[PDB]
Symmetry: C2
Subunit: 246 residues, 2 copies
């Protein structure tokens, strides 16, 4: 499995801060055939970010529409992303599910729209504190993965992200050992629906709290193939997180 390290800048950035951040990122000498490194700026920052980052960096957007072109004010179609050669999209981030009523069906239809238009997709799922405390982790994760997993047509082009919602903004912390066991179970779900070779091929990223300190303990786990990094990816020290995958 080729490691995959992603920067989800979320709703952050100025033209000036991106200029200096991309500069420091560019200073990192890495081989893009040996690991995937993807930066997801805000939509209106895409062109700026793409031009300033060297070609070794992949880029993408943080959301995509389930509808094609047409009367959908505010939406960005997969067709439009394709025409701009936007390589990656994030689908199903917990923040979309939380604040914008994004459902499992929405996730399914966004993945379909993306694959139809040859976009690569980073798909997010994960159980809450209440769900875990009620011992429903597997039930929830199985439901969420099975909502879309049968549609994957290439197991280099879809990347899964486990978001331990139960350990985000709650006071709880997920250990690498705990994360590994969930990752193992996700891969098994992929096996049971898509096949063994397919399960062994697919990247499954950790989408919880990742920083320069814990990144190695996480990526060194057998079934954790990288991360979708949030706040730590807004810092110049993000290069040290990339280094954990080198």
């Amino acid at each position: 499995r080729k490691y995959f390290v992603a920067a989800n800048w979320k709703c952050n950035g100025t033209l000036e801060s991106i200029k200096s951040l991309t500069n420091s990122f560019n200073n990192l000498d890495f081989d893009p055939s040996k690991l995937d490194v993807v930066v997801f700026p805000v939509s209106v920052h895409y062109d700026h970010t793409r031009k300033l980052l060297q070609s070794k960096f992949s880029t993408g957007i943080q959301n995509v529409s389930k509808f094609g072109n047409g009367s959908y004010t505010g939406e960005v179609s997969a067709e439009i992303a394709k025409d701009l050669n936007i390589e990656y999209v994030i689908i199903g981030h917990f923040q979309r599910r939380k604040y914008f009523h994004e459902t499992d069906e929405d996730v399914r239809e966004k993945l379909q729209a993306s694959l139809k238009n040859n976009l690569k997709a980073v798909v997010c799922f994960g159980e809450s504190l209440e769900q875990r405390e009620q011992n429903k982790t597997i039930e929830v994760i199985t439901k969420q993965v099975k909502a879309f997993v049968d549609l994957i047509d290439n197991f280099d082009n879809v990347i899964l992200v486990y978001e331990p919602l139960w350990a985000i903004g709650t006071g709880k912390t997920a250990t690498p050992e705990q994360a590994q066991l969930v990752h193992k179970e996700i891969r098994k779900i992929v096996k049971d629906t898509c096949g063994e070779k397919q399960a062994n091929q697919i990247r499954i990223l950790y989408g919880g709290s990742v920083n320069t300190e814990n990144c190695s303990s996480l990526i060194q786990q057998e079934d954790i193939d990288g991360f979708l990094v949030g706040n730590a990816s807004l810092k110049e020290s993000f290069v040290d997180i990339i280094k954990s995958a080198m």
Copy 2:
């Protein structure tokens, strides 16, 4: 009042098509000191569109976040828009209210954020066919306007849009007189909630079906100050719709 002609491209465009259209748009010699003309491209098309359009054309985005900067994956904050000198935002377009569950509360919060960040806002509202048939036009619009109207401090910087949902994709057609009557009631609602000077100052646009054949008849109405144009704004003949307000 300064007339205001707006192009809402909705979810449409390629890099090639925008190049061709903006070239045609640039051929029109109008005075931006006497007429406002605003183009709202898809978010990821903004940079491209802005660099191609002459500065006489104002530009904006089709949606804005109700949140500030931070953990809001997929969103564009008013802060980021200000940093990019994005001049205008559309808020509350019926397609966002219909497909993405946007509420009056969302519209209020988006406007508060936009004004705090010195953005100009194009705010949409209007009643369904059911509502009009139940004789509830004024009741519905009064509620929608009062959701946000107290936030307006500068009445040059917020622009209202009447969307006759009853005559959009329904088979019904609004006459310019029927549009005028609603615009007049809207202005009275602003007068009684904000003051007479403010109401005479605020621009109120027609956001129903606008084309080259009906634009003159609409702009001639005393309380219709321009348009938020959809499908017709994707055509080179959109220059003729601008001309009707010149």
